[PDB]
Amino acid sequence: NFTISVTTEILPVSMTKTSVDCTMYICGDSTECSNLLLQYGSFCTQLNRA
Amino acid sequence: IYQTSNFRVQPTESIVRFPNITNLCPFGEVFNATRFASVYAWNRKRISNC
Ligand SMILES: *[C@@H]1O[C@H](CO)[C@@H](O)[C@H](O)[C@H]1NC(C)=O
Ligand SMILES: *[C@@H]1O[C@H](CO)[C@@H](O)[C@H](O)[C@H]1NC(C)=O
Ligand SMILES: *[C@@H]1O[C@H](CO)[C@@H](O)[C@H](O)[C@H]1NC(C)=O
């Protein structure tokens, strides 16, 4: 004799696709710190692109 | 699709507010004073609400 036992198999597909502004997070929309941040490297593009 | 920049909306005027008092702080006479406290016993002066 046999049987059927349907079972659940759960698989993640998509973690919540987050996006973080490069300079809004780091600088609170100011004038001197924005220039100081751009004085750093191309991290605004790097992090946002990743 | 390309996220170019942020959208930080500029302010439209300025607002300043303060304690609604007109008292002055007794500073000038302290420097003018010939009478003066000691150093091994320096004086304290709780200036407030002015
Ligand atoms: C086999 O198992 C099922 C499960 O309940 C049952 O309904 C059926 O009668 C069984 N077959 C026999 C021949 O006993
Ligand atoms: C606060 O200041 C305003 C403007 O000087 C005045 O009209 C008002 O009466 C003041 N109120 C208090 C509680 O000091
Ligand atoms: C008293 O002190 C104030 C504040 O330091 C100064 O502006 C003023 O010139 C002083 N007065 C005299 C006579 O030195």
Side-chain angles (χ1 to χ4, degrees), chain B:
Chain B
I1 183 171
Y2 318 84
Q3 298 81 333
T4 59
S5 66
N6 47 0
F7 184 30
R8 188 62 216 186
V9 172
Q10 292 272 19
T12 177
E13 69 275 15
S14 311
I15 286 173
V16 184
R17 278 152 173 261
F18 283 124
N20 202 352
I21 195 167
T22 183
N23 181 23
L24 190 136
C25 310
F27 272 111
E29 53 182 25
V30 172
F31 309 142
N32 302 161
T34 309
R35 54 221 201 290
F36 209 79
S38 179
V39 58
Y40 68 99
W42 47 269
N43 54 319
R44 180 67 180 87
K45 186 183 180 190
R46 186 45 55 77
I47 312 165
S48 159
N49 284 328
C50 55

Side-chain angles (χ1 to χ4, degrees), chain A residues 33-49:
Chain A
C33 84
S34 180
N35 302 138
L36 263 179
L37 167 69
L38 183 62
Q39 188 170 78
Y40 279 50
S42 164
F43 282 172
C44 174
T45 45
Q46 207 174 42
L47 280 73
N48 197 8
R49 182 183 60 244

